[PDB]
């Protein structure tokens, strides 16, 4: 199972790398990034790429059972994984907010929707990621690369687990579900009073798309953040479900291009160019 799961790990890593790499390639030159949407897509692609490039390390830690890369590598890889995962989840939230303030607030938002605002918000997302992930570097050493915070080790481990759970699954889901239900509402209230709307049209396409950018995100990360807690507050033996949970967590960063990428008008045109 170790060999087959490692092969699947490599396949997923390369697929995500290809997808997000082509994303940045399309957005840098053929798209000619001007607006905030392109900045956010660029930041998300960078975050996704950085997260994805650390699969084989984990696959060797699960297969080799040791860390033959050095303590500094054990710290750095872990830190980069936390940074990329958190900033990817935050870029998703910032994209979802930028849309609510672009279809429901299309007038006053012009001041907010500027490239400078996008860049400063991106810098803030990266800074927040680093601030919330430093406790990893501060307490990461070879044991098996893991965290060995001071006693009570269990207490610090639940504190960090709940910190990440909240600040990287709940605030996003609570600000990505809301920002997408208040977007459908606007498409409904302003559809009946158009003088042409028969059976709702163009809502059947945005109500299924919107309920597909949230299910993927909330189904790739729910298993990870539930099995974690379950396991701190309960736990079990034999395991290997952790492998499934982790692969799911890394899979959300392979489908992101298929949602915020190839489905964007500029992305469609630029990909048609090549």
């Amino acid at each position: 199972s170790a060999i087959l799961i490692s092969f699947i790990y490599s396949v997923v890593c390369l697929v995500g790398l290809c997808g997000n790499s082509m994303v940045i390639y399309v957005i840098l030159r053929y798209a000619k990034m001007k607006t905030a949407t392109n900045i956010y897509i660029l930041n998300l692609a960078i975050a996704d790429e950085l997260l994805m490039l650390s699969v084989p390390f984990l696959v060797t830690s699960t297969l080799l059972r040791h860390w033959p890369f050095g303590a500094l590598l054990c710290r750095l890889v872990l830190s980069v994984d936390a940074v990329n995962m958190f900033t990817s989840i935050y870029c998703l939230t910032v994209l979802s907010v930028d849309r609510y303030v672009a279809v429901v607030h299309p007038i006053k938002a012009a001041r907010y929707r500027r490239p400078t605002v996008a860049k400063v918000v991106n810098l803030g997302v990266w800074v927040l990621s680093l601030l919330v992930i430093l406790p990893i570097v501060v307490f990461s050493r070879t044991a098996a690369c893991n965290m060995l915070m001071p006693e009570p080790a269990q207490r610090w481990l639940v504190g960090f687990v709940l910190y990440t759970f909240l600040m990287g699954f709940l605030l996003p889901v609570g600000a990505i579900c809301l920002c997408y239900v208040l977007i459908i509402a606007k498409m409904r209230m302003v559809a009946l009073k158009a003088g042409w709307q028969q059976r709702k049209r163009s809502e059947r396409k945005i109500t299924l798309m919107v309920m597909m950018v949230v299910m993927v995100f909330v189904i790739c990360w729910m298993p990870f953040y539930v099995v974690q807690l379950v396991n701190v507050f309960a736990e079990q033996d034999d395991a290997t479900v952790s492998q499934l949970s982790v692969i799911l967590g890394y899979a959300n960063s392979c489908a992101n291009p298929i949602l915020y990428g190839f489905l964007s008008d500029n992305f469609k045109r630029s990909f048609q160019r090549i």
Binding site: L58, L157, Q228, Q243, V246
Partner: peptide, 6 residues
């Protein structure tokens, strides 16, 4: 954590 309790 990533592998596995926690």
């Amino acid at each position: 954590x990533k592998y596995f309790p926690x």
